[PDB]
C-alpha cells in the first residue's frame, strides 16, 4: 500500500503510484479522462531494437566488437492538467522538535 494504492474519495476516484525515483518533498496529480475524445496526457512507445554487432561503429574505441540498443519514444501533453502539492517538512522530525 505504500507503492500502489487506490482511493475512492468524495470528489473523485484515485490511483496512487509510489515510485522512489521522483524527488521527495512533493506530490503530483494527473488527470486521465475516460472517453477517447478528450486527451490530457499520452505515452507513445514507438520502437525498441537491440542490435548485436551489425556493423555499428563504437564511439569509445572503434576497434572492439560492440552490441548496441536503443528505444524510441515520446511523451505528449495536449492539455496541461497537472497539480503540484508541496509537502513541507517531511524529514521525520515532527516528533523531535
Amino acid at each position: 500500500i505504500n507503492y500502489s494504492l487506490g482511493a475512492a474519495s468524495g470528489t473523485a476516484n484515485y490511483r496512487i503510484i509510489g515510485s522512489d525515483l521522483v524527488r521527495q518533498g512533493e506530490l503530483t496529480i494527473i488527470a486521465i479522462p475516460q472517453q477517447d475524445n478528450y486527451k490530457t496526457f499520452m505515452f507513445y512507445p514507438y520502437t525498441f531494437n537491440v542490435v548485436n554487432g551489425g556493423g555499428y561503429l563504437n564511439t569509445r574505441n572503434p576497434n572492439v566488437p560492440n552490441m548496441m540498443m536503443t528505444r524510441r519514444y515520446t511523451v505528449e501533453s495536449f492539455v496541461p492538467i497537472i497539480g503540484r502539492i508541496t509537502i513541507k517538512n517531511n524529514n521525520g522530525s515532527v516528533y523531535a522538535r
Binding site: 505504500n2 522512489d20 521527495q24 521525520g92 515532527v94 516528533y95 523531535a96
Partner: peptide, 21 residues
C-alpha cells in the same frame, strides 16, 4: 504521544527502502 515512535520507525525504514531500492 508515544504513537510518535512508530511514525519515526516507519519513516526510517521507508528511507532504507529508498536509498538501496
Amino acid at each position: 504521544w508515544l504513537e510518535g515512535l512508530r511514525e519515526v520507525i516507519d519513516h526510517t525504514t521507508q528511507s532504507m527502502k529508498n536509498d538501496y531500492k
